[PDB]
Amino acid sequence: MDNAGGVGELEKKAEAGVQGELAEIKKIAEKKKDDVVKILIET
């Protein structure tokens, strides 16, 4: 593992956090919203 530097780090970390965070938020948001809308409409 030699690939590493100010840029590669700032970039990798930037997208890492942004992606991970956004993904998670959309995961719980869509998950709960789905279960609610589903149980609501279906029942």
Residues in the chain: 43
Task: Tell me the C-alpha to C-alpha distance, in Å, between residue 32 and each of 23, 26, 27, 40.
Answer: 14, 10, 8, 12
At residue 39, the 3 state secondary structure works out as helix
CA distance 36 to 25: 16
Q: In 3D, which of 14, 21, 22, 17 has the Cα closest to residue 6?
A: 14
**Token output for 2:** 């030699």
| Token digits of residue 37 | 């809308």
Q: What's the CA gap between 29 and 31, in Å, rounded?
A: 5
**Containing domain of residue 11, as a range?**
1-43
CATH classification of the domain holding 5:
1.20.5.730
Residue written as token pair 């930037």: 14
| 17/35 Cα distance (integer angstroms) | 27
State how many domains the chain has.
1
Residue type, position 25, single letter: I
